[PDB]
Amino acid sequence: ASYINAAFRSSRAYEVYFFECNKYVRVYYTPGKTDDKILTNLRLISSGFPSLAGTAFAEPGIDCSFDTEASEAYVFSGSQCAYIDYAPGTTNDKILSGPTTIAEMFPVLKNTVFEDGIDSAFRSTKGKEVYLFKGNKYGRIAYDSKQLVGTIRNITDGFPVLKGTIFESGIDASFASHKEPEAYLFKGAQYVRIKFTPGATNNTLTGKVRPILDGWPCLRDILPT
């Protein structure tokens, strides 16, 4: 069974987009409570985002994503990526850059562990940084300069709080919360909420590692796939 393959934080307060294969939902979420609700019922990506129809991002779907600023996000499908405006509340979504390869979008990533795919990503509170995860490795990109910030290390070199959890070996999906500096990390059937600390190993777990459907019961009729 499969769960969440990608996520990103909307410009709209307390909205999140979740991608599952070739489909997605938009959820109005509630930190610390099982009061999340669906705003967009399970829909093909190609329907929600006609700009993506006929691309890898629609079929087989989006396998990594992150929000940047405004109503912009990067989306990924295998080695391909695109910069989009997801234009909430309208039909004005559009591709701003690409589709192209990861290495062409972000030349600093050419020849790195990220060039053939990214597993997960989320927006940092530090500047324009975005966390990138691939296997048990992670780095940070500043989206606006496209600079790799530092080096690509083990997840637990940045996030020792995740030692002894399955997240130490990789993350399937993630997004930054509207409640800063929290983030949600997903791995198969499970998730955890963290408070992250850029440049420090002061990150905390907010609660326990638990099944997604326990914390997000509004998803129980659509997951797993």
Residue numbers in the entry: 1 to 225
Question: How does the study describe this entry?
Answer:
Here we report the structure-function characterization of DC25, a protein from albumin fraction of Dolichos. The analysis resulted in identification of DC25, a 2S albumin homologue abundant in legumes. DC25 was characterized to be a monomeric thermostable protein. For the first time, we report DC25 being a plant origin oxidoreductase having peroxidase activity.
The structure of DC25 determined is at the highest resolution of 1.28 Å and provided better structural insights. The structure shows three monomers per asymmetric unit. Each monomer has a β-propeller domain, typical of the hemopexin superfamily proteins. The β-propeller domain is formed by circularly arranged four blades around the channel perpendicular to the plane of the blades. Each blade is composed of a β-sheet consisting of four antiparallel β-strands. The central channel consisted of four innermost β-strands of the blades, which are arranged in a parallel manner. The narrow end of the channel is lined with acidic amino acids, while the wider end is lined with basic amino acids. When the monomers of these proteins were superimposed, it was found that the core β-propeller structure was highly superimposable between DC25 and other three hemopexins from plant seeds with Cα RMSD values in the range of 0.32 Å to 0.54 Å. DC25, being homologous to CP4, LS24 and CAL, shows significant conformational differences in the loops connecting the outermost β-strands between the blades. Out of the 7 conserved water molecules, three water molecules (Wat428, 455, and 520) were present in the cavity whereas remaining four water molecules (Wat429, 437, 487 and 519) were buried and exist between the blade interfaces probably designed to stabilize the ß-propeller architecture.
